[PDB]
Amino acid sequence: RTALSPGVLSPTRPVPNWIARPEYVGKPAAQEGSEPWVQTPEVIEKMRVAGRIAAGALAEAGKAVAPGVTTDELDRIAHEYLVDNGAYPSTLGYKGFPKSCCTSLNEVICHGIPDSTVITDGDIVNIDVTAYIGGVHGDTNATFPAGDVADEHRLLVDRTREATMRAINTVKPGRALSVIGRVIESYANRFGYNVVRDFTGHGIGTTFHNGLVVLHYDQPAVETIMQPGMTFTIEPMINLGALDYEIWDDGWTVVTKDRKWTAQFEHTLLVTDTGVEILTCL
Ligand SMILES: [K+]
């Protein structure tokens, strides 16, 4: 299976005019980065709605993953499930991003832009979908196998899913945020994999990236302590190869330099009074 190359982009997909657009739509930058890390009860409830819709959109698009399909098509499907549910696709118009979800095949670490690229037997593809409704965001992603995937790749995907669930299970108030990256990296290294460091999880709420950064590798210098009402993503990218990468001319598509495949899974989490709640569930 040859290394991927930029495909061709379909035109901007329309969104019903009555669905509110986040404030950054169409602008070069977003007004985000200094919002409270702990959300109000109102916002937490709204985030449950957003997270459920994003989860449903991810699941719909994931069902279309099959050899023969284009990533653009996956985008068409998630976009339509969001709009149908009254949600705006947060990535659409986010810092110029042109589509409604990110589709990251094989060696694309993250932020692949859905295009003409056709998926072939044995590929793996991450679909990342964010919903904006009720003035809040919810983000989730998962990597899906297409046809007869090699065992190496099936294990990568399964172990990345397991690393993410183990990290989620450690979320609890009063525990250091750095426990998450410790847990992910220890599990990825058990199998000889490498955890991407330059791309991270993040606080999410009324803004898409609110300033809070969640690392997926071991970095005990971070002193942040998890607090009830904090909302953030856990979304480790795990590489079979080296971490060195390149970003395509589009300014979005990140690919591994050695072209070895990489997988990712993600949920939006809430720190509750005693533990965790996954908000991006159906
Ligand atoms: K990938």
Curated annotation (Swiss-Prot):
Signal peptide: none annotated. The keyword Cell membrane does not apply. Binds 2 divalent metal cations per subunit. Has a high-affinity and a low affinity metal-binding site. The true nature of the physiological cofactor is under debate. The enzyme is active with cobalt, zinc, manganese or divalent iron ions. Most likely, methionine aminopeptidases function as mononuclear Fe(2+)-metalloproteases under physiological conditions, and the catalytically relevant metal-binding site has been assigned to the histidine-containing high-affinity site. One of its GO terms (biological process) is proteolysis. Pfam families: Peptidase_M24. Its cofactor is Co(2+); Zn(2+); Mn(2+); Fe(2+). Keywords: Aminopeptidase, Hydrolase, Metal-binding, Protease. A divalent metal cation 1 binds at residues 128, 139, 266. Substrate binds at residues 111, 209. GO terms for molecular function: initiator methionyl aminopeptidase activity; metal ion binding; metalloaminopeptidase activity. Its EC number is 3.4.11.18. Belongs to the peptidase M24A family. Methionine aminopeptidase type 1 subfamily. NCBIfam families: met_pdase_I. Monomer. This is Methionine aminopeptidase 2.
